[PDB]
Amino acid sequence: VPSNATFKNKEKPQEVRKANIIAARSVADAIRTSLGPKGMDKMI
């Protein structure tokens, strides 16, 4: 059950995908406050 089959290598892509999701959800949080009739305008 252990020690057999295969072992995962180069686990950085697992962290790269996490860094891409966290950075994308951070952008979606600022625009989330503008959703619906109760949303607010964003001055840039």
Partner 1 sequence: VVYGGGAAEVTMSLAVSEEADKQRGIDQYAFRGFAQALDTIPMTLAENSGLDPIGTLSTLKSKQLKEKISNIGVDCLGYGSNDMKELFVVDPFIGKKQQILLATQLCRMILKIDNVIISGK
Partner 2 sequence: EGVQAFIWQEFASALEVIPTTLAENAGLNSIKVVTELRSKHENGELND
Partner 3 sequence: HAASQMAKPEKRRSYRNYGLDLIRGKIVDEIHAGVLEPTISKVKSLKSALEACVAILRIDTMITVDPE
Residues forming contacts to partner 2 in the complex (CB under 8 A) are 32-33, 35-36, 38-39
Nearer to partner 2, 12 or 24 (CB): 24
| 31-to-2, 6, 9, 25, 38 alpha-carbon distances in Å | 46, 43, 37, 10, 13
**What is the spatial distance between Cα 35 and Cα 37, in angstroms, rounded to a whole number?**
7
Q: Which is nearer to partner 2, 18 or 39 (CB)?
A: 39
Choose which of 2, 13, 36, 37 interacts with partner 1 (CB under 8 A): 2
What does the binding site for partner 1 look like in residue numbers (CB under 8 A)?
Answer: 1-3, 5-8
